Amino acid sequence: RDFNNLTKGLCTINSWHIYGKDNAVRIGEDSDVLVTREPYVSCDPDECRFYALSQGTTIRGKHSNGTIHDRSQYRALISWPLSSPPTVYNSRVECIGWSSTSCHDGKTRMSICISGPNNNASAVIWYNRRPVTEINTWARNILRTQESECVCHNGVCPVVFTDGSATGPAETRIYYFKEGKILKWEPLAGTAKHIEECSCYGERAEITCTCKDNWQGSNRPVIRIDPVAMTHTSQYICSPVLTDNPRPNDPTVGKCNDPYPGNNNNGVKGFSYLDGVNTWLGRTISIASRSGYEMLKVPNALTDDKSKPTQGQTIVLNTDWSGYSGSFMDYWAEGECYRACFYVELIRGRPKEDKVWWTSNSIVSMCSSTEFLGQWDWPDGAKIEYFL
Amino acid sequence: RDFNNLTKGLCTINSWHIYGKDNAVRIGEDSDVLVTREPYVSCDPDECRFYALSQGTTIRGKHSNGTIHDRSQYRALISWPLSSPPTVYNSRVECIGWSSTSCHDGKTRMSICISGPNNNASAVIWYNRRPVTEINTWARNILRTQESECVCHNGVCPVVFTDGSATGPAETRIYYFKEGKILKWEPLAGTAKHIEECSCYGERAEITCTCKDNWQGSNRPVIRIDPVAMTHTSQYICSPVLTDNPRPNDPTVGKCNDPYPGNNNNGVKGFSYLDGVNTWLGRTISIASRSGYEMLKVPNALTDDKSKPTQGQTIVLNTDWSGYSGSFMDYWAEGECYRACFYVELIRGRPKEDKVWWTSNSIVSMCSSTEFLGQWDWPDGAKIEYFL
Amino acid sequence: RDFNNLTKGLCTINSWHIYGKDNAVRIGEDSDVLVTREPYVSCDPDECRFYALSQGTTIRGKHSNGTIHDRSQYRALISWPLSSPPTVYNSRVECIGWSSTSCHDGKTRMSICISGPNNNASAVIWYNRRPVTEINTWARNILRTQESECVCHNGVCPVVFTDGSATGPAETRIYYFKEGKILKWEPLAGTAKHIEECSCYGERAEITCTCKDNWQGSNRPVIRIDPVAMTHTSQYICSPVLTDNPRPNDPTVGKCNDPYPGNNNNGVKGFSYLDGVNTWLGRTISIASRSGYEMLKVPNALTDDKSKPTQGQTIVLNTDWSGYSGSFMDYWAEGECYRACFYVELIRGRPKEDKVWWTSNSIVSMCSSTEFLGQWDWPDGAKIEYFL
Amino acid sequence: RDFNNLTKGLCTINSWHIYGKDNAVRIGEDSDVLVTREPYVSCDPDECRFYALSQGTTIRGKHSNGTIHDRSQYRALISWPLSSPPTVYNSRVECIGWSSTSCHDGKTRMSICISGPNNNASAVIWYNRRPVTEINTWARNILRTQESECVCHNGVCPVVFTDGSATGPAETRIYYFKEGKILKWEPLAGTAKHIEECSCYGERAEITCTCKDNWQGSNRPVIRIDPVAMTHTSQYICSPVLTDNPRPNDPTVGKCNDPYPGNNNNGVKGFSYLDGVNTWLGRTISIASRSGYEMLKVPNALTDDKSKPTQGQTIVLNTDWSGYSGSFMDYWAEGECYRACFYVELIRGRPKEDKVWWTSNSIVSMCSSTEFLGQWDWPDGAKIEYFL
Ligand SMILES: *[C@@H]1O[C@H](CO)[C@@H](O[C@@H]2O[C@H](CO)[C@@H](O[C@@H]3O[C@H](CO[C@H]4O[C@H](CO)[C@@H](O)[C@H](O)[C@@H]4O)[C@@H](O)[C@H](O[C@H]4O[C@H](CO)[C@@H](O)[C@H](O)[C@@H]4O[C@H]4O[C@H](CO)[C@@H](O)[C@H](O)[C@@H]4O[C@H]4O[C@H](CO)[C@@H](O)[C@H](O)[C@@H]4O)[C@@H]3O)[C@H](O)[C@H]2NC(C)=O)[C@H](O)[C@H]1NC(C)=O
Ligand SMILES: *[C@@H]1O[C@H](CO)[C@@H](O[C@@H]2O[C@H](CO)[C@@H](O[C@@H]3O[C@H](CO[C@H]4O[C@H](CO)[C@@H](O)[C@H](O)[C@@H]4O)[C@@H](O)[C@H](O[C@H]4O[C@H](CO)[C@@H](O)[C@H](O)[C@@H]4O[C@H]4O[C@H](CO)[C@@H](O)[C@H](O)[C@@H]4O[C@H]4O[C@H](CO)[C@@H](O)[C@H](O)[C@@H]4O)[C@@H]3O)[C@H](O)[C@H]2NC(C)=O)[C@H](O)[C@H]1NC(C)=O
Ligand SMILES: *[C@@H]1O[C@H](CO)[C@@H](O[C@@H]2O[C@H](CO)[C@@H](O[C@@H]3O[C@H](CO[C@H]4O[C@H](CO)[C@@H](O)[C@H](O)[C@@H]4O)[C@@H](O)[C@H](O[C@H]4O[C@H](CO)[C@@H](O)[C@H](O)[C@@H]4O[C@H]4O[C@H](CO)[C@@H](O)[C@H](O)[C@@H]4O[C@H]4O[C@H](CO)[C@@H](O)[C@H](O)[C@@H]4O)[C@@H]3O)[C@H](O)[C@H]2NC(C)=O)[C@H](O)[C@H]1NC(C)=O
Ligand SMILES: *[C@@H]1O[C@H](CO)[C@@H](O[C@@H]2O[C@H](CO)[C@@H](O[C@@H]3O[C@H](CO[C@H]4O[C@H](CO)[C@@H](O)[C@H](O)[C@@H]4O)[C@@H](O)[C@H](O[C@H]4O[C@H](CO)[C@@H](O)[C@H](O)[C@@H]4O[C@H]4O[C@H](CO)[C@@H](O)[C@H](O)[C@@H]4O[C@H]4O[C@H](CO)[C@@H](O)[C@H](O)[C@@H]4O)[C@@H]3O)[C@H](O)[C@H]2NC(C)=O)[C@H](O)[C@H]1NC(C)=O
Ligand SMILES: *[C@@H]1O[C@H](CO)[C@@H](O[C@@H]2O[C@H](CO)[C@@H](O)[C@H](O)[C@H]2NC(C)=O)[C@H](O)[C@H]1NC(C)=O
Ligand SMILES: *[C@@H]1O[C@H](CO)[C@@H](O[C@@H]2O[C@H](CO)[C@@H](O)[C@H](O)[C@H]2NC(C)=O)[C@H](O)[C@H]1NC(C)=O
Ligand SMILES: *[C@@H]1O[C@H](CO)[C@@H](O[C@@H]2O[C@H](CO)[C@@H](O)[C@H](O)[C@H]2NC(C)=O)[C@H](O)[C@H]1NC(C)=O
Ligand SMILES: *[C@@H]1O[C@H](CO)[C@@H](O[C@@H]2O[C@H](CO)[C@@H](O)[C@H](O)[C@H]2NC(C)=O)[C@H](O)[C@H]1NC(C)=O
Ligand SMILES: *[C@@H]1O[C@H](CO)[C@@H](O)[C@H](O)[C@H]1NC(C)=O
Ligand SMILES: *[C@@H]1O[C@H](CO)[C@@H](O)[C@H](O)[C@H]1NC(C)=O
Ligand SMILES: *[C@@H]1O[C@H](CO)[C@@H](O)[C@H](O)[C@H]1NC(C)=O
Ligand SMILES: [Ca+2]
Ligand SMILES: [Ca+2]
Ligand SMILES: [Ca+2]
Ligand SMILES: [Ca+2]
Ligand SMILES: [Ca+2]
Structure with missing residues (x-):
């Protein structure tokens, strides 16, 4: 309809309630579940879905061997219904690549996938399920992006990218897209010394991204x-x-x-x-x-x-494995405030569990409650021994 | 469109005709069927579907071992097309938890899932597929609800919950929800001494719930x-x-x-x-x-x-296994009266059939006929020996 | 929209062209295909689909043993996309039973399923995917119907049923339904001595049914x-x-x-x-x-x-197995005439191929061409040896 | 809505970016993926999909043995969501046959499938998912067509067919269809000496087809x-x-x-x-x-x-296997020019890899970029040894 505007502030977070959980690894032990990693969650005005980077093979499949590797020509950004597992039959491919981001601007969705060899990667920006813009690597060293949803305001959807070293200063850029087109880009400024994999959310016309300083910081940029x-x-x-x-x-x-x-x-x-x-x-x-x-x-x-x-x-x-975690919110929910949400990637397999030759994960996600709710723990739930 | 109002009375029940049957256990012996229990049926204005609490694993999967247990972090309320089995690929997750209820008010659907440890559970009320309200345990002893559909009248959807002992007096509450929000709640009154798992239906602006007195009664509250x-x-x-x-x-x-x-x-x-x-x-x-x-x-x-x-x-x-049973009706059918319907959970596996390590079920459901129809029996139909 | 009226005559049939083929048995050797029999084809105004009586088990599943039997509580009328096979995941259950018919009147579809023991069967007539009318057995001896599509004219959809002996005179009735309700029924009249499994089509406000005289005739009633x-x-x-x-x-x-x-x-x-x-x-x-x-x-x-x-x-x-065959036409196609179509059930397994313990089939279907087209033969295509 | 008109010229091609890749063979090693060959890509106004000729069996299925053969009664033109693999459960059959083409005219899609024995084949032209026209073989020697998308302009969709010898002069015809009906056909003229499998695209009211001279030419007609x-x-x-x-x-x-x-x-x-x-x-x-x-x-x-x-x-x-390649464009994309796209069929199995008894393929596809993007190579990615 109209572009969404970040007009609300966050709801008061007094606790976290269970939002979604797919039990992918448990289920996939005996069904056609794709091997994944780098998952996230993102909402459209009428539906919220799970997203992740597929490895182009099922967990039980013989090609699961070697999926500890992050980048290959067999990966793709896929999305599937909330809390279902990423199966061969219900997974929708958004774009091809090994690093991504995606967000709905209120009218339609923008998805970005970066692919290529380390020294010659490129990002392709899709809008309304069509390729619109392409950006070539600027530092020739693993062009990479968020791995979680971007956020839009009045059609403008900023995205943080990094190209260059992971253990020294790199070239981070903030791109402002609108309908898949580049309105502007800036180099990173401020005091953050290194940026990678930003997790963002928006409220009251401002977008906040908590990222990762791979180089030196244990506090987050x-x-x-x-x-x-x-x-x-x-x-x-x-x-x-x-x-x-x-x-x-x-x-x-x-x-x-x-x-x-x-x-x-x-x-x-x-x-x-x-x-x-x-x-x-x-x-x-x-x-x-x-x-x-x-x-x-x-x-x-x-x-x-x-x-x-x-x-x-x-x-x-x-006593349970976790992994990546990121933010997202349903900007199209009812009410006067945006309810903060997040997901945790529950990594199974390599390198921690090396009796199997694969690496995958499941997803657990929560949203805030204004109540002070009792807490439970939410593990992946799979028994590795079953896969042996 | 508009909220549904319970304006009709029940049709005359002269017999019961077959409505739906999924043969889940038979089919699942060789296909990706999720292990479930606590099933029910519930209608939307344009479709009627099967519902149940998944165990987060297929029946043939190795994680089916231990599914006799009622509460875990791997359960979720799922729905799927009438008479199909609950498969990994066609099951839609409504919410995460080990106790639930769900009902359509004529405009959209409200689903409720309770999760947590025994002493710290919480219910989250979803409306229009989004989390809206959360209720923390009040007696710190297995907050639990209907396990079958709720019923609405002019947007008001009452739900019966119980928290506390299963073998002594407990704290049962009736919540009146509207668009996922709490309009009011009351403590149980009257002469029923203990309430659990209410099966409800509505007619002529009144909602009748037949429940279970786990503590003392063999007659039903x-x-x-x-x-x-x-x-x-x-x-x-x-x-x-x-x-x-x-x-x-x-x-x-x-x-x-x-x-x-x-x-x-x-x-x-x-x-x-x-x-x-x-x-x-x-x-x-x-x-x-x-x-x-x-x-x-x-x-x-x-x-x-x-x-x-x-x-x-x-x-x-x-000579055949049954289990839970509950009521539902298609409040959006044509005609001058509401046709009474019910389902029977056909439990297979543990504890009665312990040669297998799992517990699951299939569903059979009937609706009333004004005719005096001949009768057939409707067993699950699976041969346990095949699973050995 | 409006009820369809049989206003056109048949197109000139100069040959038959391939319309649909599902290769169900070939595919099902290594995928989750339901065992079926008694298939047919039927069109809605916007789609044409395959239909059949499922046996409530996959072909590779252990419960396929014994599927030579015609009537059980595990059967159901299912429909699925044209030329796809009937899989557990894409098959839509229309109703439960072991004998059926179905047809679209232009506004919505009527499906009929008969279930029960031999001496106490009953038909339930569904309209707009809801049960509307029920008819109890009148002769207490396998109430049964068409096993192929019915046909409608201005909302009136006649259906032929038979109840009683298969090897002597029986009680055949013609029911005229409208919106799932019985407008009228007649006993069979004329010179046909026994009627079973009518295959019907409509043209110029007349419905023609070619049936089967199980008792005495080798010519068709x-x-x-x-x-x-x-x-x-x-x-x-x-x-x-x-x-x-x-x-x-x-x-x-x-x-x-x-x-x-x-x-x-x-x-x-x-x-x-x-x-x-x-x-x-x-x-x-x-x-x-x-x-x-x-x-x-x-x-x-x-x-x-x-x-x-x-x-x-x-x-x-x-040198190839066939089976049942019936008529259907796409009453919603463009043009000035109705194109005659038919399907042939290609039965595999018992009793002819008894090295396997199951009985199933695939479907091939053709429609007429005004051209004089070259001909090919269309076998099931599966190798039984693979199933051993 | 309205028929599409080829009003734009091609965008400047400065490089090629990744568009879609299904990793079918990798995934199918452990999931229900249909064996195929002769794939292509084609867009509707609201979606772009992968297309191919199925072999009527899964890759892991025993009937995969012998799929090196090009023509059988078990083949069909199927389409499925972009970048997903062709599975038994998500593949939509467009028509039955062993040679095909398909294209959307802006209002609806026309699909053509040719089937038959070598000396008696026939094409059936489907429009709006219904059979409309049939054309009998004119030279009685493998009537065959494009194996990639056709292109339309103001409702007119030309298609190139060939019938007769593959190693001498044959009878190639250009048919101009509109709503599945034949407006006109011409014999091939010009200097091309032999035509087969044309790959076409349209721009500025002209349709260009690059085909193959099987008989004598190594340059393309x-x-x-x-x-x-x-x-x-x-x-x-x-x-x-x-x-x-x-x-x-x-x-x-x-x-x-x-x-x-x-x-x-x-x-x-x-x-x-x-x-x-x-x-x-x-x-x-x-x-x-x-x-x-x-x-x-x-x-x-x-x-x-x-x-x-x-x-x-x-x-x-x-060092990687390729195969057929063809053109397609999204004629319904935004912008001032048509972005050139193509796919490459990555053939696996026979005859090059004869340790397996099947022949199949996966698909990789690219579209042009006005940027000068870095390049990656895109192999099928499957390990044949896994299939042994
Ligand atoms: C039913 O459900 C309810 C709701 O969930 C349950 O109630 C909850 O209970 C929680 C557990 O007790 C509680 O969580 C804790 O809250 C503490 C804050 O509250 C207390 O302090 C405030 C401020 O004074 C008071 O107002 C308040 O009254 C309380 O007294 C947090 O401080 C806790 O976090 C710290 O402890 C946990 C271990 O419990 C650590 O994992 C965590 O990281 C925190 O401690 C580390 O970090 C701090 C800060 O630097 C360090 O000082 C500290 O030494 C720790 O550092 C080590 O460990 C970290 C992590 O490994 C490492 O990086 C570092 O280097 C060091 O090695 C904790 O979050 C909820 O608030 C409470 N909720 C409510 C609404 O009451 C209830 O129990 C349940 N009922 C039943 C029957 O089970
Ligand atoms: C074709 O189809 C038609 C339609 O289905 C078939 O016709 C049906 O046939 C049914 C079976 O006969 C029949 O069902 C029975 O109806 C009885 C009521 O009708 C009779 O009584 C009334 C009232 O006087 C008369 O008007 C009428 O004419 C009849 O004479 C019920 O009473 C029956 O239920 C009781 O029996 C069954 C066993 O048959 C028990 O399982 C059931 O629980 C009932 O009995 C228990 O409970 C009562 C009440 O407390 C006790 O008194 C009794 O002792 C039993 O108690 C023990 O068992 C229970 C359960 O285990 C336990 O808890 C307790 O502690 C004790 O141990 C039964 O429901 C249909 O009404 C009839 N329908 C029609 C329309 O005619 C026809 O047969 C089929 N044709 C063919 C050829 O097969
Ligand atoms: C490329 O494609 C084209 C198009 O398909 C191919 O051309 C087609 O070729 C077909 C095969 O030749 C042909 O089909 C036959 O048509 C005959 C009718 O045409 C002839 O007679 C008419 C009338 O005089 C002439 O006008 C015309 O010119 C022809 O001369 C039918 O009669 C044929 O059916 C009978 O034969 C077949 C076996 O071929 C039987 O299976 C069938 O049942 C018919 O015969 C039985 O039944 C009759 C009637 O009772 C009995 O008299 C007879 O003895 C048989 O009875 C026994 O068998 C039955 C069945 O088992 C049993 O029940 C009974 O008790 C007995 O035991 C046949 O239908 C197409 O018409 C023709 N199409 C066109 C457009 O030309 C072309 O060949 C292909 N090209 C290549 C290179 O392959
Ligand atoms: C990061 O990404 C970028 C972007 O992709 C990378 O940059 C690209 O690098 C490519 C590889 O170098 C390059 O591709 C080549 O372009 C050549 C044309 O450019 C050159 O010539 C022009 C004209 O003078 C100059 O303007 C320009 O400056 C360059 O000097 C092509 O000529 C190349 O194709 C030929 O070589 C390849 C092998 O590399 C063959 O496979 C291909 O078939 C061509 O050669 C055959 O055919 C010709 C014509 O008949 C014959 O003359 C020749 O002998 C060969 O013939 C044999 O082989 C064929 C095929 O097997 C057989 O049929 C025949 O019978 C003979 O046996 C090649 O296409 C991109 O243009 C360049 N892109 C850009 C934007 O710069 C960059 O490297 C990457 N970075 C890193 C770090 O890796
Ligand atoms: C978000 O903010 C913009 C204003 O910046 C709204 O856009 C206006 O919407 C109306 C109706 O579409 C137009 O007539 C105005 O011209 C639009 N835009 C501008 C940029 O002035 C937009 O509608 C707001 N979004 C929502 C959901 O209200
Ligand atoms: C159920 O009852 C309420 C009346 O209590 C109906 O609600 C009225 O509907 C019309 C049209 O939406 C409004 O103009 C009235 O104000 C509505 N509500 C109230 C609460 O007064 C409702 O339409 C009835 N449902 C149906 C299906 O008829
Ligand atoms: C089939 O025939 C009936 C007439 O018998 C058509 O029904 C009429 O349709 C118009 C528009 O719906 C109404 O105003 C008439 O009263 C309708 N019915 C009768 C029974 O008189 C019907 O429209 C025809 N179907 C089609 C597709 O044209
Ligand atoms: C493609 O070109 C034709 C004109 O050749 C356009 O067709 C006209 O469309 C309008 C609206 O449908 C009609 O009133 C004209 O009569 C149409 N046709 C002809 C053949 O004159 C068509 O709309 C164009 N397509 C697009 C997408 O603009
Ligand atoms: C199931 O779990 C039990 C209890 O842990 C274990 O002893 C048993 O062997 C398991 N059964 C199977 C088939 O794995
Ligand atoms: C099928 O059932 C028959 C009859 O019960 C039994 O003897 C036979 O062994 C079964 N076949 C298989 C493969 O189970
Ligand atoms: C495939 O078919 C060939 C030819 O019929 C046969 O000899 C071969 O053994 C088959 N291969 C397999 C694995 O069945
Ligand atoms: Ca760090
Ligand atoms: Ca399997
Ligand atoms: Ca009790
Ligand atoms: Ca006979
Ligand atoms: Ca050549």
């Missing part, structure tokens, strides 16, 4: 975008409650404009909702591996370098 | 709801034709306001159509187990403590 | 129905070109009002297009078994007791 | 059609950059009106975009087998007998 002025700023979450993985133990004081040191060249896609006292941070429980997952209410985390948790909710036990 | 005044009453079916399972043998006189004694802390979800002389009761044939199923016309069963059968129809032979 | 007056007549195809199976060899003169003798208590569902010189008869090539299939142009076959073929087309070689 | 005047011309691509397979090595000067000699009675379906300096030719890398695939910018290839490449892009490495 944040990019705040003005989609009208088509400008942005960047900094790090000030809070001592560190949210990357791996990471050092939490200090008593964090860093607002520099990476918090202790762990180099590694990390995991993650997210946060930065809204004053209504601030919630997601993170793996383990400081060493992609294990467990918890949400922590850390009032003013973005700007307070001594902020610590006032409430929390465990999502996945530390 | 009944809750009659006024969805306009948003008030209710409760009693037991007066009839000596006892309809819970297990149960003692039928006496010559029943109880109207107390549980009929003889069997404690056990029972099965069931239903009835209480409409004066047009009254029909469903029940297992066996007084000891979930075996067989029959419909008995017991005129004035609700109010006559000496009422006995005047007609009957066998649905499932006593 | 024909019922011509006036859907406006709601009256009918019956006789036999006069032609010496005999079209039942089994049957004696063709004589030089046939019978117009008596069964042509030579074979008792057996037969096969079949069809014909009786339109003066534009008359075409279908039949198995073998006089002993359901083997092969051919179309023969026999001018004035219905009324000329010495009529013999003037043209022909082989459909299935005598 | 080209047919340019005027869909308004319903007339055409034919010649060969003048360029010395030879594009059939097998073929001799490239000379320094080609032939404009005669086949370039060196290889007789063999070839492969291929295509080209002939647009002055914006000319791009596709071809296998190997001159001996269907191995590899590359796009070469050869300015004025059609008319310049000394034209050589000025740019290029490798699509499939010479």
